[PDB]
PDB file of all heavy atoms in Angstrom:
ATOM      1  N   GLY A  29      73.677 152.219  -4.436  1.00 57.90           N
ATOM      2  CA  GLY A  29      73.088 152.944  -3.346  1.00 57.90           C
ATOM      3  C   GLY A  29      74.064 153.813  -2.567  1.00 57.90           C
ATOM      4  O   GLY A  29      73.721 154.347  -1.506  1.00 57.90           O
ATOM      5  N   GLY A  30      75.285 153.951  -3.085  1.00 57.90           N
ATOM      6  CA  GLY A  30      76.331 154.756  -2.379  1.00 57.90           C
ATOM      7  C   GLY A  30      76.020 156.266  -2.403  1.00 57.90           C
ATOM      8  O   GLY A  30      75.196 156.689  -3.148  1.00 57.90           O
ATOM      9  N   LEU A  31      76.719 156.977  -1.541  1.00 57.19           N
ATOM     10  CA  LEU A  31      76.458 158.403  -1.372  1.00 57.19           C
ATOM     11  C   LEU A  31      77.319 159.266  -2.322  1.00 57.19           C
ATOM     12  O   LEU A  31      78.464 158.974  -2.569  1.00 57.19           O
ATOM     13  CB  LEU A  31      76.817 158.766   0.064  1.00 57.19           C
ATOM     14  CG  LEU A  31      76.410 160.141   0.591  1.00 57.19           C
ATOM     15  CD1 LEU A  31      74.925 160.311   0.673  1.00 57.19           C
ATOM     16  CD2 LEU A  31      77.060 160.378   1.950  1.00 57.19           C
ATOM     17  N   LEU A  32      76.741 160.363  -2.799  1.00 59.29           N
ATOM     18  CA  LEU A  32      77.380 161.326  -3.640  1.00 59.29           C
ATOM     19  C   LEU A  32      77.320 162.697  -2.996  1.00 59.29           C
ATOM     20  O   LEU A  32      76.231 163.184  -2.728  1.00 59.29           O
ATOM     21  CB  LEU A  32      76.723 161.373  -4.986  1.00 59.29           C
ATOM     22  CG  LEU A  32      77.257 160.429  -6.022  1.00 59.29           C
ATOM     23  CD1 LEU A  32      76.291 160.461  -7.180  1.00 59.29           C
ATOM     24  CD2 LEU A  32      78.644 160.884  -6.470  1.00 59.29           C
ATOM     25  N   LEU A  33      78.484 163.335  -2.859  1.00 59.95           N
ATOM     26  CA  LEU A  33      78.541 164.623  -2.243  1.00 59.95           C
ATOM     27  C   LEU A  33      79.309 165.611  -3.120  1.00 59.95           C
ATOM     28  O   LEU A  33      80.485 165.378  -3.439  1.00 59.95           O
ATOM     29  CB  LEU A  33      79.294 164.541  -0.900  1.00 59.95           C
ATOM     30  CG  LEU A  33      78.722 163.599   0.165  1.00 59.95           C
ATOM     31  CD1 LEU A  33      79.652 163.557   1.316  1.00 59.95           C
ATOM     32  CD2 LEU A  33      77.311 164.028   0.626  1.00 59.95           C
ATOM     33  N   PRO A  34      78.650 166.673  -3.606  1.00 61.19           N
ATOM     34  CA  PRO A  34      77.202 166.873  -3.583  1.00 61.19           C
ATOM     35  C   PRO A  34      76.475 165.878  -4.501  1.00 61.19           C
ATOM     36  O   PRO A  34      77.132 165.184  -5.299  1.00 61.19           O
ATOM     37  CB  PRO A  34      77.045 168.281  -4.129  1.00 61.19           C
ATOM     38  CG  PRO A  34      78.212 168.451  -5.073  1.00 61.19           C
ATOM     39  CD  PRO A  34      79.350 167.718  -4.365  1.00 61.19           C
ATOM     40  N   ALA A  35      75.146 165.850  -4.392  1.00 58.88           N
ATOM     41  CA  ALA A  35      74.320 164.899  -5.071  1.00 58.88           C
ATOM     42  C   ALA A  35      73.764 165.391  -6.427  1.00 58.88           C
ATOM     43  O   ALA A  35      73.469 164.576  -7.306  1.00 58.88           O
ATOM     44  CB  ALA A  35      73.155 164.501  -4.152  1.00 58.88           C
ATOM     45  N   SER A  36      73.611 166.696  -6.530  1.00 56.61           N
ATOM     46  CA  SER A  36      72.991 167.263  -7.677  1.00 56.61           C
ATOM     47  C   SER A  36      73.507 168.666  -7.922  1.00 56.61           C
ATOM     48  O   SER A  36      74.073 169.308  -7.003  1.00 56.61           O
ATOM     49  CB  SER A  36      71.471 167.309  -7.513  1.00 56.61           C
ATOM     50  OG  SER A  36      71.063 168.172  -6.468  1.00 56.61           O
ATOM     51  N   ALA A  37      73.259 169.146  -9.143  1.00 52.36           N
ATOM     52  CA  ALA A  37      73.559 170.533  -9.552  1.00 52.36           C
ATOM     53  C   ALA A  37      72.422 171.120 -10.310  1.00 52.36           C
ATOM     54  O   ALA A  37      71.686 170.423 -11.027  1.00 52.36           O
ATOM     55  CB  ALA A  37      74.803 170.568 -10.381  1.00 52.36           C
ATOM     56  N   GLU A  38      72.290 172.442 -10.211  1.00 52.78           N
ATOM     57  CA  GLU A  38      71.334 173.188 -10.993  1.00 52.78           C
ATOM     58  C   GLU A  38      71.940 174.414 -11.599  1.00 52.78           C
ATOM     59  O   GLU A  38      72.775 175.051 -10.955  1.00 52.78           O
ATOM     60  CB  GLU A  38      70.113 173.556 -10.120  1.00 52.78           C
ATOM     61  CG  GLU A  38      69.283 172.383  -9.647  1.00 52.78           C
ATOM     62  CD  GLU A  38      68.474 172.769  -8.428  1.00 52.78           C
ATOM     63  OE1 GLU A  38      69.024 172.703  -7.294  1.00 52.78           O
ATOM     64  OE2 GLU A  38      67.258 173.170  -8.589  1.00 52.78           O
ATOM     65  N   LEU A  39      71.570 174.669 -12.849  1.00 50.14           N
ATOM     66  CA  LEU A  39      71.964 175.919 -13.539  1.00 50.14           C
ATOM     67  C   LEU A  39      70.816 176.929 -13.675  1.00 50.14           C
ATOM     68  O   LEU A  39      69.672 176.523 -13.910  1.00 50.14           O
ATOM     69  CB  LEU A  39      72.486 175.592 -14.944  1.00 50.14           C
ATOM     70  CG  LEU A  39      73.902 175.058 -14.991  1.00 50.14           C
ATOM     71  CD1 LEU A  39      74.100 174.168 -16.216  1.00 50.14           C
ATOM     72  CD2 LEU A  39      74.943 176.161 -14.909  1.00 50.14           C
ATOM     73  N   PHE A  40      71.184 178.185 -13.569  1.00 50.82           N
ATOM     74  CA  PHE A  40      70.248 179.314 -13.608  1.00 50.82           C
ATOM     75  C   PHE A  40      70.730 180.401 -14.585  1.00 50.82           C
ATOM     76  O   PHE A  40      71.919 180.593 -14.724  1.00 50.82           O
ATOM     77  CB  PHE A  40      70.103 179.924 -12.229  1.00 50.82           C
ATOM     78  CG  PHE A  40      69.605 178.988 -11.206  1.00 50.82           C
ATOM     79  CD1 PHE A  40      70.483 178.192 -10.505  1.00 50.82           C
ATOM     80  CD2 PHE A  40      68.257 178.816 -10.968  1.00 50.82           C
ATOM     81  CE1 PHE A  40      70.046 177.305  -9.543  1.00 50.82           C
ATOM     82  CE2 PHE A  40      67.780 177.922 -10.070  1.00 50.82           C
ATOM     83  CZ  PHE A  40      68.675 177.161  -9.325  1.00 50.82           C
ATOM     84  N   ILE A  41      69.771 181.086 -15.218  1.00 51.27           N
ATOM     85  CA  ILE A  41      70.059 182.181 -16.111  1.00 51.27           C
ATOM     86  C   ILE A  41      69.151 183.388 -15.726  1.00 51.27           C
ATOM     87  O   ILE A  41      68.013 183.162 -15.357  1.00 51.27           O
ATOM     88  CB  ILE A  41      69.853 181.811 -17.578  1.00 51.27           C
ATOM     89  CG1 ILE A  41      70.223 182.954 -18.501  1.00 51.27           C
ATOM     90  CG2 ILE A  41      68.403 181.331 -17.855  1.00 51.27           C
ATOM     91  CD1 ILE A  41      70.393 182.560 -19.974  1.00 51.27           C
ATOM     92  N   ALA A  42      69.670 184.602 -15.867  1.00 52.36           N
ATOM     93  CA  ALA A  42      68.824 185.783 -15.750  1.00 52.36           C
ATOM     94  C   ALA A  42      69.349 186.858 -16.625  1.00 52.36           C
ATOM     95  O   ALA A  42      70.556 186.956 -16.851  1.00 52.36           O
ATOM     96  CB  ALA A  42      68.695 186.250 -14.300  1.00 52.36           C
ATOM     97  N   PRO A  43      68.460 187.742 -17.177  1.00 52.30           N
ATOM     98  CA  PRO A  43      68.930 188.926 -17.901  1.00 52.30           C
ATOM     99  C   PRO A  43      69.551 189.844 -16.862  1.00 52.30           C
ATOM    100  O   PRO A  43      69.139 189.874 -15.734  1.00 52.30           O
ATOM    101  CB  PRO A  43      67.654 189.492 -18.484  1.00 52.30           C
ATOM    102  CG  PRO A  43      66.557 189.039 -17.578  1.00 52.30           C
ATOM    103  CD  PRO A  43      66.983 187.690 -17.086  1.00 52.30           C
ATOM    104  N   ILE A  44      70.554 190.597 -17.294  1.00 50.20           N
ATOM    105  CA  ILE A  44      71.261 191.463 -16.356  1.00 50.20           C
ATOM    106  C   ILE A  44      71.563 192.832 -16.990  1.00 50.20           C
ATOM    107  O   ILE A  44      71.648 192.995 -18.205  1.00 50.20           O
ATOM    108  CB  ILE A  44      72.541 190.809 -15.834  1.00 50.20           C
ATOM    109  CG1 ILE A  44      73.447 190.246 -16.921  1.00 50.20           C
ATOM    110  CG2 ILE A  44      72.241 189.612 -14.963  1.00 50.20           C
ATOM    111  CD1 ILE A  44      74.591 191.151 -17.268  1.00 50.20           C
ATOM    112  N   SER A  45      71.764 193.805 -16.106  1.00 50.79           N
ATOM    113  CA  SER A  45      72.350 195.083 -16.371  1.00 50.79           C
ATOM    114  C   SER A  45      73.568 195.186 -15.455  1.00 50.79           C
ATOM    115  O   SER A  45      73.409 195.331 -14.230  1.00 50.79           O
ATOM    116  CB  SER A  45      71.379 196.218 -16.067  1.00 50.79           C
ATOM    117  OG  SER A  45      71.820 197.434 -16.644  1.00 50.79           O
ATOM    118  N   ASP A  46      74.727 195.073 -16.061  1.00 51.08           N
ATOM    119  CA  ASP A  46      75.973 195.076 -15.345  1.00 51.08           C
ATOM    120  C   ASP A  46      76.417 196.539 -15.091  1.00 51.08           C
ATOM    121  O   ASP A  46      76.935 197.223 -16.007  1.00 51.08           O
ATOM    122  CB  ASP A  46      77.021 194.280 -16.139  1.00 51.08           C
ATOM    123  CG  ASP A  46      78.367 194.233 -15.471  1.00 51.08           C
ATOM    124  OD1 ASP A  46      78.626 194.969 -14.483  1.00 51.08           O
ATOM    125  OD2 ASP A  46      79.201 193.438 -15.941  1.00 51.08           O
ATOM    126  N   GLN A  47      76.138 197.007 -13.874  1.00 52.37           N
ATOM    127  CA  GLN A  47      76.422 198.423 -13.557  1.00 52.37           C
ATOM    128  C   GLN A  47      77.921 198.766 -13.751  1.00 52.37           C
ATOM    129  O   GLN A  47      78.238 199.877 -14.186  1.00 52.37           O
ATOM    130  CB  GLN A  47      75.934 198.772 -12.162  1.00 52.37           C
ATOM    131  CG  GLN A  47      76.133 200.245 -11.733  1.00 52.37           C
ATOM    132  CD  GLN A  47      75.442 201.262 -12.562  1.00 52.37           C
ATOM    133  OE1 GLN A  47      75.951 201.812 -13.576  1.00 52.37           O
ATOM    134  NE2 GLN A  47      74.276 201.705 -12.138  1.00 52.37           N
ATOM    135  N   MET A  48      78.757 197.833 -13.382  1.00 48.39           N
ATOM    136  CA  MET A  48      80.227 198.100 -13.555  1.00 48.39           C
ATOM    137  C   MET A  48      80.580 198.261 -15.035  1.00 48.39           C
ATOM    138  O   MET A  48      81.335 199.137 -15.411  1.00 48.39           O
ATOM    139  CB  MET A  48      81.026 196.957 -12.911  1.00 48.39           C
ATOM    140  CG  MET A  48      80.810 196.889 -11.390  1.00 48.39           C
ATOM    141  SD  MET A  48      81.437 198.298 -10.427  1.00 48.39           S
ATOM    142  CE  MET A  48      83.189 198.242 -10.794  1.00 48.39           C
ATOM    143  N   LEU A  49      79.958 197.390 -15.878  1.00 47.23           N
ATOM    144  CA  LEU A  49      80.157 197.549 -17.366  1.00 47.23           C
ATOM    145  C   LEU A  49      79.628 198.897 -17.787  1.00 47.23           C
ATOM    146  O   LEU A  49      80.283 199.587 -18.579  1.00 47.23           O
ATOM    147  CB  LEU A  49      79.475 196.398 -18.115  1.00 47.23           C
ATOM    148  CG  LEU A  49      79.444 196.525 -19.645  1.00 47.23           C
ATOM    149  CD1 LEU A  49      80.832 196.604 -20.239  1.00 47.23           C
ATOM    150  CD2 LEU A  49      78.681 195.333 -20.254  1.00 47.23           C
ATOM    151  N   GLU A  50      78.410 199.251 -17.346  1.00 45.94           N
ATOM    152  CA  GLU A  50      77.845 200.512 -17.732  1.00 45.94           C
ATOM    153  C   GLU A  50      78.798 201.678 -17.406  1.00 45.94           C
ATOM    154  O   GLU A  50      78.950 202.574 -18.222  1.00 45.94           O
ATOM    155  CB  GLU A  50      76.456 200.624 -17.099  1.00 45.94           C
ATOM    156  CG  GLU A  50      75.690 201.843 -17.568  1.00 45.94           C
ATOM    157  CD  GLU A  50      75.110 201.757 -18.982  1.00 45.94           C
ATOM    158  OE1 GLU A  50      75.153 200.664 -19.675  1.00 45.94           O
ATOM    159  OE2 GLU A  50      74.617 202.837 -19.421  1.00 45.94           O
ATOM    160  N   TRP A  51      79.379 201.661 -16.241  1.00 49.30           N
ATOM    161  CA  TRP A  51      80.380 202.700 -15.832  1.00 49.30           C
ATOM    162  C   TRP A  51      81.601 202.726 -16.796  1.00 49.30           C
ATOM    163  O   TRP A  51      82.108 203.790 -17.121  1.00 49.30           O
ATOM    164  CB  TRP A  51      80.764 202.632 -14.378  1.00 49.30           C
ATOM    165  CG  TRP A  51      79.594 203.045 -13.477  1.00 49.30           C
ATOM    166  CD1 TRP A  51      78.627 203.919 -13.784  1.00 49.30           C
ATOM    167  CD2 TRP A  51      79.345 202.579 -12.135  1.00 49.30           C
ATOM    168  NE1 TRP A  51      77.759 204.039 -12.736  1.00 49.30           N
ATOM    169  CE2 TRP A  51      78.177 203.231 -11.713  1.00 49.30           C
ATOM    170  CE3 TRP A  51      80.000 201.689 -11.312  1.00 49.30           C
ATOM    171  CZ2 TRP A  51      77.623 203.018 -10.449  1.00 49.30           C
ATOM    172  CZ3 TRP A  51      79.447 201.471 -10.024  1.00 49.30           C
ATOM    173  CH2 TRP A  51      78.255 202.137  -9.596  1.00 49.30           C
ATOM    174  N   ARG A  52      82.033 201.557 -17.230  1.00 50.28           N
ATOM    175  CA  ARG A  52      83.133 201.509 -18.210  1.00 50.28           C
ATOM    176  C   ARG A  52      82.747 202.085 -19.580  1.00 50.28           C
ATOM    177  O   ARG A  52      83.562 202.763 -20.211  1.00 50.28           O
ATOM    178  CB  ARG A  52      83.621 200.078 -18.388  1.00 50.28           C
ATOM    179  CG  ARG A  52      84.211 199.501 -17.133  1.00 50.28           C
ATOM    180  CD  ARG A  52      84.959 198.186 -17.441  1.00 50.28           C
ATOM    181  NE  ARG A  52      86.126 198.469 -18.282  1.00 50.28           N
ATOM    182  CZ  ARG A  52      86.843 197.549 -18.946  1.00 50.28           C
ATOM    183  NH1 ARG A  52      86.553 196.293 -18.805  1.00 50.28           N
ATOM    184  NH2 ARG A  52      87.848 197.942 -19.695  1.00 50.28           N
ATOM    185  N   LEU A  53      81.526 201.767 -20.010  1.00 48.16           N
ATOM    186  CA  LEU A  53      81.007 202.348 -21.281  1.00 48.16           C
ATOM    187  C   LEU A  53      80.810 203.887 -21.162  1.00 48.16           C
ATOM    188  O   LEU A  53      81.115 204.572 -22.149  1.00 48.16           O
ATOM    189  CB  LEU A  53      79.745 201.644 -21.677  1.00 48.16           C
ATOM    190  CG  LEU A  53      79.814 200.123 -21.962  1.00 48.16           C
ATOM    191  CD1 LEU A  53      78.452 199.569 -22.293  1.00 48.16           C
ATOM    192  CD2 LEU A  53      80.809 199.816 -23.056  1.00 48.16           C
ATOM    193  N   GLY A  54      80.380 204.346 -20.019  1.00 49.74           N
ATOM    194  CA  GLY A  54      80.118 205.765 -19.818  1.00 49.74           C
ATOM    195  C   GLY A  54      81.343 206.588 -19.467  1.00 49.74           C
ATOM    196  O   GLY A  54      81.313 207.793 -19.510  1.00 49.74           O
TER     197      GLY A  54
END
């Protein structure tokens, strides 16, 4: 029953358009 700090984690994903990358490519 002891405490954990932090108690949990969550992972997230999203499709991206990296504008900085795009400027390097261009």
Side-chain angles (χ1 to χ4, degrees):
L31 190 68
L32 270 169
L33 302 175
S36 65
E38 295 159 274
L39 282 154
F40 300 88
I41 183 166
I44 52 99
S45 194
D46 181 349
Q47 181 62 271
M48 296 294 298
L49 173 57
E50 186 73 8
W51 291 331
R52 296 192 66 191
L53 297 178

